Amino acid sequence: NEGQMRELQDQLEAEQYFSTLYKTQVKELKEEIEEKNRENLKKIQELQNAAATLATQLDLAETKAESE
Amino acid sequence: QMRELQDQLEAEQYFSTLYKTQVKELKEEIEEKNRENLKKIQELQNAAATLATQLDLAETKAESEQL
């Protein structure tokens, strides 16, 4: 009977180990995802800047053309 | 008592499984993102191409109308 107990306890310690391990894996991945979203957003913002200049030059060309 | 210990073991087992499944979901999500990004960048490239071509034609025309 004490054997059953000892074995169950062993099992429990094992699963505590794995449970913890994967619990941290999740955390890491969540962090990684958040980083990727941040970085992605930043790069899109840079693209938007790059496009803005074109848009303005065309705007001013257009209105300037619309005066003459 | 050891029924308590059985229950606790099974709760832990539940959690280990749960976390493994969550990891697989998240890895999936990451891959899908890496796909979607790629695709969208390519779409942007296509959309820029047209403007590029029109500008090229324009620049030729402007150079040629010169005196």
Numbering used by the authors:
A (entry chain D): 835 to 902
B (entry chain C): 838 to 904
In the authors' words:
Vertebrates have two highly related Rock proteins, Rock1 and Rock2, which share 65% sequence identity to each other. Both contain an N-terminal kinase domain, a centrally located coiled coil region and C-terminal pleckstrin homology (PH) and cysteine-rich domains. Rock catalytic activity is inhibited by a direct intramolecular interaction between the kinase domain and sequences within a large C-terminal fragment of Rock containing 200 residues of the coiled-coil region, the PH domain , and the cysteine-rich domain. To accomplish this task, Shrm3 is localized to apically positioned sites of cell-cell adhesion in polarized cells, where it directly interacts with Rock through a highly conserved domain on its C-terminus called the Shrm Domain 2 (SD2).
While binding affinity was somewhat reduced in this assay for the smaller 834–913 fragment, both Rock1 proteins were still capable of binding SD2 with affinities comparable to that observed between Drosophila Rock and Shrm. Together, these data suggest that there is a stable Shrm binding domain (SBD) composed of residues 834–913 of hRock1. Diffraction quality was greatly improved through the introduction of a triple alanine mutation, 884EKE886, suggested by the Surface Entropy Reduction server and termed SBDSER. Crystals of SBDSER belong to space group C21 and also exhibit anisotropy with diffraction extending to 2.5 Å along a* and c* but only 3.1 Å along the b* plane. Phases were determined using the SAD method, and the final model was refined against native data at 2.5 Å resolution to Rwork and Rfree values of 23.6% and 27.6% respectively. SBDSER crystals contain two parallel coiled-coil dimers in the asymmetric unit packed in a tail-to-tail arrangement. Each SBD monomer is an entirely helical segment ∼100 Å in length and the completed model minimally contains residues 838–902 from each molecule. The C-terminal end of each dimer is splayed open allowing the formation of a helical bundle beginning at residue 875. The SBDSER mutant that facilitates crystallization, positions 884–886, is located within the center of this helical bundle. The helix is noticeably kinked after the SBDSER positions suggesting that the substitutions at the SBDSER positions may have altered the overall structure of the SBD to favor the formation of a helical bundle between residues 875–902. Since SBDSER is dimeric in solution, crystal packing forces, perhaps accentuated by additional hydrophobic interactions found in the SBDSER variant, are likely responsible for the observed helical bundle.
